[PDB]
Amino acid sequence: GETKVIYHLDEEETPWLVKIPVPAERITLGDFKSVLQRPAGAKYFFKSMDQDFGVVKEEISDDNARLPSFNGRVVSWLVSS
Amino acid sequence: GETKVIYHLDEEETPWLVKIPVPAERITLGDFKSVLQRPAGAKYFFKSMDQDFGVVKEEISDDNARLPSFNGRVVSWLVSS
Amino acid sequence: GETKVIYHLDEEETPWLVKIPVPAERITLGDFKSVLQRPAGAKYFFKSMDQDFGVVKEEISDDNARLPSFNGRVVSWLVSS
Amino acid sequence: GETKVIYHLDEEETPWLVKIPVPAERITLGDFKSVLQRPAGAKYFFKSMDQDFGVVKEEISDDNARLPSFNGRVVSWLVSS
Amino acid sequence: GETKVIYHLDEEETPWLVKIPVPAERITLGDFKSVLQRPAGAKYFFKSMDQDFGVVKEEISDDNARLPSFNGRVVSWLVSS
Amino acid sequence: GETKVIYHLDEEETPWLVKIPVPAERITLGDFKSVLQRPAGAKYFFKSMDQDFGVVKEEISDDNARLPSFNGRVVSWLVSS
């Protein structure tokens, strides 16, 4: 199983792409943070869905929390402290 | 207790969603600002009600002020300086 | 003393509400502009009265000019350049 | 010298009021358009008089043309394209 | 055959340029690491393309993996541990 | 003819300066290495230009290769093995 994570770092226009050997059905914030060099201090937002608002960027801070995905892809924005 | 805050940053079309572990009955602007990386300099507006105008976006600048909410959800627009 | 200003931005349906700590008897366009993030370039119109026409939207461009109000409330429309 | 211009925008019931620092004896369509944010594309009509019809709304398209007025007041209807 | 590799080291503004005597069609991460003094501990990202996102910086960790290139040039960012 | 070579040794902040009695138009990596006490094992990078990237640090490993210079000055970074 493999998940592609496309992530943006602060205001940088060019996104980063990492492939994590965990299937998207199981992938957690901790799995993502494990592949980042400096996971600390940042807030993590993920492309997700809200009933009223449609597409939103949802903050997830718990390493055990599952990440939202579409067709095996997670899209994230990092905001550094 | 938990409050969902859906917020817009300036003219960005896609909203952000954060969950704050304070019940909506007690949630304050300071509680919201505490979860933002850079709370300073911005003005904060919240979906609210006016007697004559109905739905409005109400500016709240005092950290001790309670935020308007509906069914545990706050909707906010941030305008940066 | 406090004045409530309900204002519309261009064609946006949902109005904004700000409370300004100046009594309505003294409030000026400059007082209003001081609480806007980007006061420049816009024209400001205020709910007012004309002898022949009744309710009108009156343009006020001078920061020292007093704003028309009713029961401590000013209603304004902003038109951006 | 000052001219008051009361103008209606398409079918909007509430008129707008602007004061232009040109005396009514000299005021031209261009003077009026100079104070509008988006003068283009619209047709401009002004309260005027016809010999047979009495009060009419007269179209004026030339910026150098003088505007009809009564006691320092011009009344106009704008029709957008 | 020769490949030019332009690489950035952490946050250093000035890039480094190395020429590797392997044609770009065959060049692998291991070929690049072989010319670095201290290849260990770092993560390696390469200018690449994603179907939805366009230009991205793609992490490649396997020495046997081919590097993306354009006209014989590879562009890389190194992030140290 | 004389070339000034300003060089940095690994992470040492303070650069070294040597003057080599060869004109900059002809100076080669071998000429530089001849004035170093321990030229072996190190990689040598030189301030240079790339069409797309502008200023870069270009690795040169061949003793017969000419060094890039500006106004008779070469700037180099050494990385030890």
Side-chain angles (χ1 to χ4, degrees):
Chain A
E2 182 181 81
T3 301
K4 290 187 182 56
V5 181
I6 292 93
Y7 62 96
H8 307 78
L9 190 54
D10 302 296
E11 291 309 316
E12 294 179 7
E13 309 168 45
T14 306
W16 305 76
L17 170 61
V18 297
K19 308 178 202 251
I20 304 172
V22 176
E25 315 78 62
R26 310 191 300 230
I27 189 173
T28 65
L29 174 67
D31 289 322
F32 181 29
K33 292 169 74 176
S34 76
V35 311
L36 302 174
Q37 292 283 56
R38 293 162 177 85
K43 302 270 188 173
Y44 300 84
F45 297 81
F46 298 91
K47 187 184 180 186
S48 188
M49 289 291 306
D50 175 80
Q51 51 171 357
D52 298 324
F53 286 83
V55 177
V56 301
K57 300 178 175 175
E58 179 177 338
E59 194 248 353
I60 299 182
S61 68
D62 183 345
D63 289 353
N64 282 331
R66 294 226 164 120
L67 303 183
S69 65
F70 184 82
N71 291 4
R73 300 157 64 92
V74 171
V75 184
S76 182
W77 291 262
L78 275 62
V79 186
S80 54
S81 65
Chain B
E2 182 181 81
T3 301
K4 290 187 182 56
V5 181
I6 292 93
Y7 62 96
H8 307 78
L9 190 54
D10 302 296
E11 291 309 316
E12 294 179 7
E13 309 168 45
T14 306
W16 305 76
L17 170 61
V18 297
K19 308 178 202 251
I20 304 172
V22 176
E25 315 78 62
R26 310 191 300 230
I27 189 173
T28 65
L29 174 67
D31 289 322
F32 181 29
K33 292 169 74 176
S34 76
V35 311
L36 302 174
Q37 292 283 56
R38 293 162 177 85
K43 302 270 188 173
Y44 300 84
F45 297 81
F46 298 91
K47 187 184 180 186
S48 188
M49 289 291 306
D50 175 80
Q51 51 171 357
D52 298 324
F53 286 83
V55 177
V56 301
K57 300 178 175 175
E58 179 177 338
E59 194 248 353
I60 299 182
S61 68
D62 183 345
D63 289 353
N64 282 331
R66 294 226 164 120
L67 303 183
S69 65
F70 184 82
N71 291 4
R73 300 157 64 92
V74 171
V75 184
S76 182
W77 291 262
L78 275 62
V79 186
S80 54
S81 65
Chain C
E2 182 181 81
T3 301
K4 290 187 182 56
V5 181
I6 292 93
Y7 62 96
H8 307 78
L9 190 54
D10 302 296
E11 291 309 316
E12 294 179 7
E13 309 168 45
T14 306
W16 305 76
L17 170 61
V18 297
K19 308 178 202 251
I20 304 172
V22 176
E25 315 78 62
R26 310 191 300 230
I27 189 173
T28 65
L29 174 67
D31 289 322
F32 181 29
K33 292 169 74 176
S34 76
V35 311
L36 302 174
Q37 292 283 56
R38 293 162 177 85
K43 302 270 188 173
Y44 300 84
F45 297 81
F46 298 91
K47 187 184 180 186
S48 188
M49 289 291 306
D50 175 80
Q51 51 171 357
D52 298 324
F53 286 83
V55 177
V56 301
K57 300 178 175 175
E58 179 177 338
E59 194 248 353
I60 299 182
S61 68
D62 183 345
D63 289 353
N64 282 331
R66 294 226 164 120
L67 303 183
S69 65
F70 184 82
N71 291 4
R73 300 157 64 92
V74 171
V75 184
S76 182
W77 291 262
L78 275 62
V79 186
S80 54
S81 65
Chain D
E2 182 181 81
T3 301
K4 290 187 182 56
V5 181
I6 292 93
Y7 62 96
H8 307 78
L9 190 54
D10 302 296
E11 291 309 316
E12 294 179 7
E13 309 168 45
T14 306
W16 305 76
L17 170 61
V18 297
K19 308 178 202 251
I20 304 172
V22 176
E25 315 78 62
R26 310 191 300 230
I27 189 173
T28 65
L29 174 67
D31 289 322
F32 181 29
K33 292 169 74 176
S34 76
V35 311
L36 302 174
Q37 292 283 56
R38 293 162 177 85
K43 302 270 188 173
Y44 300 84
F45 297 81
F46 298 91
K47 187 184 180 186
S48 188
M49 289 291 306
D50 175 80
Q51 51 171 357
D52 298 324
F53 286 83
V55 177
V56 301
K57 300 178 175 175
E58 179 177 338
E59 194 248 353
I60 299 182
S61 68
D62 183 345
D63 289 353
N64 282 331
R66 294 226 164 120
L67 303 183
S69 65
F70 184 82
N71 291 4
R73 300 157 64 92
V74 171
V75 184
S76 182
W77 291 262
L78 275 62
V79 186
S80 54
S81 65
Chain E
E2 182 181 81
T3 301
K4 290 187 182 56
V5 181
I6 292 93
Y7 62 96
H8 307 78
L9 190 54
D10 302 296
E11 291 309 316
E12 294 179 7
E13 309 168 45
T14 306
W16 305 76
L17 170 61
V18 297
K19 308 178 202 251
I20 304 172
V22 176
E25 315 78 62
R26 310 191 300 230
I27 189 173
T28 65
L29 174 67
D31 289 322
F32 181 29
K33 292 169 74 176
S34 76
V35 311
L36 302 174
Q37 292 283 56
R38 293 162 177 85
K43 302 270 188 173
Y44 300 84
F45 297 81
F46 298 91
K47 187 184 180 186
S48 188
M49 289 291 306
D50 175 80
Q51 51 171 357
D52 298 324
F53 286 83
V55 177
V56 301
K57 300 178 175 175
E58 179 177 338
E59 194 248 353
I60 299 182
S61 68
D62 183 345
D63 289 353
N64 282 331
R66 294 226 164 120
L67 303 183
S69 65
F70 184 82
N71 291 4
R73 300 157 64 92
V74 171
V75 184
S76 182
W77 291 262
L78 275 62
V79 186
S80 54
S81 65
Chain F
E2 182 181 81
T3 301
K4 290 187 182 56
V5 181
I6 292 93
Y7 62 96
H8 307 78
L9 190 54
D10 302 296
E11 291 309 316
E12 294 179 7
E13 309 168 45
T14 306
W16 305 76
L17 170 61
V18 297
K19 308 178 202 251
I20 304 172
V22 176
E25 315 78 62
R26 310 191 300 230
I27 189 173
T28 65
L29 174 67
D31 289 322
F32 181 29
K33 292 169 74 176
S34 76
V35 311
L36 302 174
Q37 292 283 56
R38 293 162 177 85
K43 302 270 188 173
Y44 300 84
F45 297 81
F46 298 91
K47 187 184 180 186
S48 188
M49 289 291 306
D50 175 80
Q51 51 171 357
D52 298 324
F53 286 83
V55 177
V56 301
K57 300 178 175 175
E58 179 177 338
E59 194 248 353
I60 299 182
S61 68
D62 183 345
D63 289 353
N64 282 331
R66 294 226 164 120
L67 303 183
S69 65
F70 184 82
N71 291 4
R73 300 157 64 92
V74 171
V75 184
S76 182
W77 291 262
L78 275 62
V79 186
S80 54
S81 65

